[PDB]
Amino acid sequence: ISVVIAGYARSPFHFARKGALVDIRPDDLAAAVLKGLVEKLDLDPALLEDVVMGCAYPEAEQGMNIARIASFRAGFPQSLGGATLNRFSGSSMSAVHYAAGQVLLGAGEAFIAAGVESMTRVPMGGFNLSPNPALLQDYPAVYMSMGQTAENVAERYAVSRVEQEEMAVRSHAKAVAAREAGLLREEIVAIDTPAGRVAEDGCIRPGTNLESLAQLKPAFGGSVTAATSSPLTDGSAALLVCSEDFARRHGLVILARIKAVAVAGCAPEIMGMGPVQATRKVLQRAGLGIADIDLVEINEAFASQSIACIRELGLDMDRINLDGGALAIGHPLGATGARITGKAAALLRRTGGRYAIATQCIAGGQGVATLLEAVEL
Amino acid sequence: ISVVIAGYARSPFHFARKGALVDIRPDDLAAAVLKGLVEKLDLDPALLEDVVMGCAYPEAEQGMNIARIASFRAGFPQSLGGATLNRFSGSSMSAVHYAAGQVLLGAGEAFIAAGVESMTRVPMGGFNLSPNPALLQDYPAVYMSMGQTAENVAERYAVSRVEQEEMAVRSHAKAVAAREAGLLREEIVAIDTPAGRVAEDGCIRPGTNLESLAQLKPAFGGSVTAATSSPLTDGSAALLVCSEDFARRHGLVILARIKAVAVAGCAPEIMGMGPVQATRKVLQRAGLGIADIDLVEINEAFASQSIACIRELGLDMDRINLDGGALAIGHPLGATGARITGKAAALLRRTGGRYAIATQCIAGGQGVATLLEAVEL
């Protein structure tokens, strides 16, 4: 069975606490994106087997199996399944991997693989934090801050502050170029809020420049700053993962075929390097080399780790994050894996490429990757 | 690729608050079962791709991606992935479905599909409960209590109090018969506690009888009682899900082959009927009928719903929960799906049967099922 991505939708992404989505509960935000996806495809949600929702902190407003809450809030029929999946920042990419496996098993033909984070309304870390006392004593790197891991990569992989800032300039310039060309509009579901309808991304900072960035304070006692870190973000993203036969029968435009998937573990103290081994695994599984990949969506958790991974894999920077990356677009942890996988698929179709990879790092030392191919191949 | 279950281990299951595992954090409990599984198989955990841990309330001591915390606490290498999956009571059966799909994708050869719940230390429901205000107003059945759903099944499916109590008598008698024959020992990993080593299940009530059960108070204003409900329970269970080639190469005894998997949604107000449609789906996908199934593990969330499902599917009660069911064994929500799937596999091998099904209901109106086959077929 050929497994494809045949739809991609997301909310605008906004800053936590200070942006336009602070009043929207994450279950309602996710439900709006689920509804917007099936409406853009003119697809009866009764045809869906299951909704798998990535969420890094699935508690409080993100609790009670937010996949199923969001499905009911979207008015989807009770016949669907729903399950919530936490692999921190990679959650909704693992939702794609889950769905792709069920398609291959013949355990249903059509799935939503989605994610959500309201970093406003469920702050990163959750409530009632309770680290394991034995690991905290014997293996403290398990609970290392993300910023310290970013400094560890900057030091050990030799990514200077100025190199990090150059990536922030390019991420924002590419995001602005894409936004101004209308190239972010089709993937967006506008969201209704008390202040009105939100249709545009909020984290992009046009005219980001080296001189302004050099004035910022270090965020973590070293090279990294707020500008070279993904911001705290609210957002949701959703993909239709289905058999190729299902997509063709319902007249859906196929963005890409899923050719290979992977997870890989790494040292937690340098968790930002997760993408290297996860990318090498999809390449090996696909029978491809890095030189075969037209474009990559590598999540910009921090410039230090994104650059370090790009260099280690031998990637051309001109093939990275074509319409901007998370330093500009934002990073609502549970939602990002669906966004970068869907965006990689939509970009592969838009550019007429053959292969794409979406990949990202994960707290606790992991990486995930997805290798996409043009469905014609 | 042939996907098999080649190992099954679990802690003893104990009552929440009053049983023998109250002092054991759920991450440590899960880590002990992960270690016990690979040790019983003499299997290097460096060979594992990923740990997928089911957990119904993954917050507080169950937070921070308990799959990965448990993996590190078990001393497993950083190269493994870990992800936490919430489909309430079906969480760790969906972990099996996830792993089986990754095996079929060629995305690794060996996985742990596990679950944990410490209903002592993370009470059912979580902390900071925040139901969706629109669903609470327009669709209150989404948040219906499990007991009310059990009464709704008892009424609508005509399962009398005495019929419910007859299932409690049989569940405990079968659990006692199995325990006294040594038939629960091989699946158990003993747990070290402040009070000493815990090796035996704690929820079994030998001599459960109709006269004593008839004296109990209704638990939910109707027919159901504490004795005809699964208890609040602490426990963890873990399966090795791998390719048949992997199992053969590492000399592992194959308990069963995974032949079909399913999820299905249903009305939340009668969520206990989830197993009917999930079982019909695995039967359809396997090309089998109910008369082809040697044995079933149908989780005993409540006698009312277990009986109603058994009758609707046309199952012989003598083929159900051979070594006891959850009224006697207990039901630590995140752990149960791994336990009943692993137990069904171990029972299929022990009895020399051809086919088994493991199936259960899920809060919010869902069911999950797994159809197992003898690997020789």
Ligand SMILES: CC(=O)SCCNC(=O)CCNC(=O)[C@H](O)C(C)(C)COP(=O)(O)OP(=O)(O)OC[C@H]1O[C@@H](n2cnc3c(N)ncnc32)[C@H](O)[C@@H]1OP(=O)(O)O
């Ligand atoms: C494993 C993974 O995937 S990591 C994912 C998990 N997520 C994280 O780790 C979150 C990472 N980010 C963070 O923790 C936070 O964003 C931090 C700590 C880095 C920074 O937080 P804050 O200090 O609140 O940032 P804030 O938005 O206030 O920015 C600080 C300053 O930089 C400025 N700034 C930020 N970006 C830019 C830019 N592109 N150009 C110019 N100025 C900028 C801000 O405007 C602000 O200026 P001000 O003080 O004059 O108002």
Ligand SMILES: CC(=O)SCCNC(=O)CCNC(=O)[C@H](O)C(C)(C)COP(=O)(O)OP(=O)(O)OC[C@H]1O[C@@H](n2cnc3c(N)ncnc32)[C@H](O)[C@@H]1OP(=O)(O)O
């Ligand atoms: C969707 C799903 O999968 S549902 C899964 C989610 N889990 C749940 O819904 C939990 C279901 N169970 C519960 O909520 C609780 O166990 C309840 C509310 C039903 C009962 O809770 P409690 O009243 O604390 O039960 P408790 O253990 O105290 O039992 C009450 C009495 O019945 C007795 N009893 C229980 N089982 C038996 C039995 N087999 N034989 C005789 N007496 C019994 C107890 O000993 C106790 O007697 P006592 O008052 O003399 O001490």
